[PDB]
Amino acid sequence: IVGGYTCGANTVPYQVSLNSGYHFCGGSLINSQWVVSAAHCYKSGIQVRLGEDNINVVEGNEQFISASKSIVHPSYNSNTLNNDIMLIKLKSAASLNSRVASISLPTSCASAGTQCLISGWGNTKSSGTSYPDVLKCLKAPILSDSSCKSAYPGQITSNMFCAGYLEGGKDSCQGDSGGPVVCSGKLQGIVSWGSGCAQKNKPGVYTKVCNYVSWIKQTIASN
Ligand SMILES: [Ca+2]
């Protein structure tokens, strides 16, 4: 399988589903009490769902915990999607185990050509509407900034990166907003946006988490 595939149940134990009566976004557990997602996923009355695979069926490993708090990045711009990052605090601590685990924050930014893992539940179809029920995965390289910016001239900031293939075919667009991009075991990316869907010279665009680590640590410690 070159591209999107079924992860396997609980193979991505940091992966979280944000539910408002339905699954609406992804997010990542970064410690027992906190979740990172995209600021475009901001909503009232989130329930965070951990240990999911099939989000429509109770399979036994789940943990369902209300969000108590959401903090959108102070410089989030919802027009440009610049600084598309939000922190979500859990009402009760998650219970950590094999299937429900934190993902580390990066100590450095990952370089172009680094292979990363992108996960989520969202739409599989570049052309049409098909929403799958178990966790899906994609492995794609981080693209060079030149290649990213040339695909979206005037749209890419320092706080974004692109990942995938310049030919398209394989991408995450609506393919799970707020979901993780993990590279060498560290959280590098958040599924942010992407013009079209797996279009030729239209990659995925991700929030560059390595720019935010000071923000995330300071904010979680003070809240
Ligand atoms: Ca389930």
Task: Give structural notes.
By secondary structure, this protein is mainly beta. It folds into two domains: 1-12 and 103-210, Thrombin, subunit H (Beta Barrel), CATH 2.40.10.10; 13-102 and 211-223, Trypsin-like serine proteases (Thrombin, subunit H), CATH 2.40.10. It contains two helices and 13 strands, in the order βββββββββαββββα. It has helices at 145-151, 213-221, and strands at residues 5-6, 15-19, 23-31, 34-37, 47-50, 63-72, 86-90, 115-120, 136-141, 160-163, 180-183, 186-193, 204-208. It has a seven-stranded antiparallel beta sheet with strand order 1-9-8-11-12-13-10. A six-stranded antiparallel β-barrel has the order 2-3-4-7-6-5. It is globular. It starts with a strand and ends with a helix. The structure holds calcium ion. Calcium ion is lined by residues 52-55, 57-59, 62. GO terms for molecular function: endopeptidase activity; metal ion binding; serine-type endopeptidase activity; serpin family protein binding. The active site is at 40 (charge relay system), 84 (charge relay system), 177 (charge relay system).
Strand and helix map with partners:
Blueprint: E1 5-6, E2 15-19, E3 23-31, E4 34-37, E5 47-50, E6 63-72, E7 86-90, E8 115-120, E9 136-141, H1 145-151, E10 160-163, E11 180-183, E12 186-193, E13 204-208, H2 213-221
Antiparallel strand pairs: 1-9, 2-3, 2-5, 3-4, 4-7, 5-6, 6-7, 8-9, 8-11, 10-13, 11-12, 12-13
